[PDB]
Paper text:
Belonging to the transient receptor potential melastatin family (TRPM), [name] shares a characteristic MHR1-4 domain, a transmembrane domain (TMD), and a coiled-coil domain with the other family members. In summary, our human [name] structures defined two distinctive ADPR binding sites, one in the MHR1/2 domain and one in the NUDT9-H domain.
In the EDTA-hsTRPM2 structure, the NUDT9-H domain is clamped between cognate and adjacent MHR1/2 domains, forming both intra- and intersubunit interfaces, while only the intrasubunit interface exists in the EDTA-drTRPM2 structure. In the absence of ADPR, their interface is made of extensive interactions between the core region of NUDT9-H and MHR1. Accordingly, we call the interface between MHR1/2 and NUDT9-H a resting interface in the apo state and an activation interface in the ADPR-bound state. The EDTA-hsTRPM2 and the 8-Br-cADPR/Ca2+-hsTRPM2 structures were nearly identical, and they clearly represented an apo-resting state and an antagonist-bound inhibited closed state, respectively. By comparing the distances between the Cα of adjacent pore-restricting residues—N1049 and Q1053—with those in drTRPM2, all four showed an occluded pore, including the ADPR/Ca2+-hsTRPM2 structure.
Author numbering:
A (entry chain D): 1128 to 1165
B (entry chain A): 1053 to 1098, 1105 to 1165
C (entry chain A): 524 to 581, 614 to 976
D (entry chain D): 902 to 980, 1020 to 1052
E (entry chain C): 977 to 980, 1020 to 1052
Amino acid sequence: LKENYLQNRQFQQKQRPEQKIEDISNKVDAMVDLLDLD
Amino acid sequence: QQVQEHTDQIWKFQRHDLIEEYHGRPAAPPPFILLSHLQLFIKRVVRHKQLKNKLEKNEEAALLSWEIYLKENYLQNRQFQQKQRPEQKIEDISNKVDAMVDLLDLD
Amino acid sequence: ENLDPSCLFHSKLQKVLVEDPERPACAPAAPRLQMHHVAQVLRELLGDFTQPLYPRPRHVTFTMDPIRDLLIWAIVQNRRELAGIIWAQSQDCIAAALACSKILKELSKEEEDTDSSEEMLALAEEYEHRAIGVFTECYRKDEERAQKLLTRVSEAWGKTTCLQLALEAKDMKFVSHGGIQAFLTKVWWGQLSVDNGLWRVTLCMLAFPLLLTGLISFREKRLQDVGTPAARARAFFTAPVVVFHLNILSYFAFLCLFAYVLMVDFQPVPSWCECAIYLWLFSLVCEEMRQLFYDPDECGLMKKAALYFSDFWNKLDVGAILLFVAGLTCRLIPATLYPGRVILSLDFILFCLRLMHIFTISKTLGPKIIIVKRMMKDVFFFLFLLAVWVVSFGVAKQAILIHNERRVDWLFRGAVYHSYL
Amino acid sequence: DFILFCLRLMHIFTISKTLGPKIIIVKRMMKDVFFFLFLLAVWVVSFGVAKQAILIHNERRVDWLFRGAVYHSYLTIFGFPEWLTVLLLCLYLLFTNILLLNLLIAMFNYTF
Amino acid sequence: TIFGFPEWLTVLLLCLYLLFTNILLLNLLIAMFNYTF
C-alpha cells in the first residue's frame, strides 16, 4: 500500500500547472539550442 | 467589524512614548518626588545612553561591514524569488519564442 | 543646478534662493546656488530635529559619503529606476531607506497634482518595505547585535538614530515588526530578566528582603550571581515597571484618601488632610509641568505645547486641574460651601476616570480601548434619538390619561417617574 | 466545599460530541471576563460614592447610610429636583446601559 | 435571583452572583448560538 500511495502522489504532483509551465519552459531551450547550432 | 482588524498596529505604534516617558521619569512616587525635583533644580542652578549612543569607530566599522554583507544577501534572495513568479515565467517564455520565429522566417 | 523645472522641489529651492538676504546683498541680478541652500530646504522636509547636512562655509574634494547625496538628488525628482540602482550600493542602508520614506511622505502632502502624488506615496511605501526586508535578515542571524542598529547615531543623516526616523515618518509596518517590540519590551523590563511575570514583581514589590532571596530573575549574571544587595536593590528600583507600579499605587492611595476627605472630613475651616491632598495635587502638576520643559532637541515650545494639548488624557488632566482650582476658591468663600462640595464631587469623578489609562499597557486590552473610543461617536447620536422618542411617548401618555392640570412638581414628576420606569 | 464539589459536575460534557469545544471556549473567555469585571466594579463604586456624596450631608452612620447607599448602588447595578434628578438619571442611562455592553459585544465577539 | 457586620458578607455574596450569573453563561450562549446560527 505504501508503494501504491507513492505512485499516486508522484502522478498528482506531475499535474500541477506550475510544474507544467516549468517543463514547457525547459523543453523550448533544447529547440533554441538545436536551431542556433546548425 | 470595521476597525477590529488592524488596530493592534496602532497600539504597537502607540506603545513607544509610554515606554520612553517612564524611562525618563525620576524614580520617586509623587509624594516623595519633590526632593528629586529640587535636586534637579540644583542641576538647573549649576539624554540617556540607552536610546541614543555614539559608538566607537573601530567597532562601528565592523558593524557597518556586517550590515553591508547582509544587505547583499537580501538582494540576492529577493532577485531570485522575483524570478520565480509564474507571470514572469510566461513573459520569458513568450519572449523566447520570438527568436525562434525570426530565425525560422529569415533562413 | 539642472533639476527638471516641473518638480515641486525646484520651486521650493527657487523660493529659498530668492528669500536669502546675502545674495541680493551681493548682487540682486545674480542669485547663486550654494549647497547650504539645499541643506536648508532639506532640513524643512526631513524634520527640525536633525542637523544641516551640508555645513555653511565661513584640486578636487569629496564630501563624506557621496552616495547619500546622489540618492537624495535622485529621490526628490521622483526617479524610481535610478534610486533603485543607487540604493543598492549605499553604506548604511536602513537609515537611508527610512529617511527616503520620510522625505517622500512629506513631499507628497503638498504637491496639488494627483498622479505624481500617488507615485510618490507608492515609492515611499516601497522604500519602507526595503528597510523591513533588510532588518529582518539582520535579525535572523544575531539577536543582540541587531538591536544596536536601532539605536546608534549615524553622522551621515544629521546625527539622528534609526528609530526616530521610523517614529516620525509614521512607518507603521516597521515599528510593528516584532524585533522592535522585543527591544521595547527589553527596555521596559530594564535591568532584570523579562520572563519572571507580573505577580512575582508584585510580591517583591511588597516584600523588601524577598529580593535578597533566590525567588527573582536577573540577566547579566555578574549581578545575579555576585550578590551586592544595595546594587541589586538599586537595579530593581531603577526598572520602569517598578516605577509604574509604585506610581499607580500612590495614585490609588491618593484617590482613596481624597474620597475619605470628601465624604466626612469636609469642613469650612481648613483641615490638615485638605493641605495633604493640596500638596499631592501640587506635586502631580509639578511633574506634569516638568514633562513639558524637557525637549533636548531645540524644537518648538509652541509645537511641544500643541502636541501636549492635543492629547486626550492631557486634556482630561487639565480639565481636572481647572475644576479643582475652581472648587478650591469656591470652598474658601464660606457662603459657598455646598457648591464647593458638589464641584469637588464632580472633580473626584473626573479624577477617577483617569484610572482607565492603565489597560493601555496591557497586551490584549489596549485595542478594546481604541474600539470604544471609536464607538462613542455614534453612541451619542443614538442617545439623542432615543431621548426624543421617550419624551414623545411620555408626554403622549401624560396627555391622554389626564385632564389639564397645572401641578408643578406633582403630576409632571409623577409622569417623569412613570416614563423613567 | 459543597459548592466546590458541585462545580466538578461540569466535567461531564467534555465527553459529549458537540459540547466539549464550548467548554474550551469558556475556559478561554474567563481571562478577560475577570479584567472587565475589575473596571466595571471601579466604575460602579465611583458613581455610588458620588451619589452618596452629593445628595447627603456628612453623616457618620456605620451601617445605616453606608448600607443604604450600598443597597441603592446594588439596585442601580441590577438594572427643584426635576432637573437634578433628570441629569443624574440620564447620566446613568448614558454611561451604564450602553458603553460597557458595547465593549463586551466587541471583546466577546472578538475572542469567540 | 434567576429572574434578574453584614456589609462584607452581603457584598461578597452579591459580587459572586454578579460575577458568575450575569456574565459567563451568556457568553457561552453568544458563542454557541452564533456558532450554530
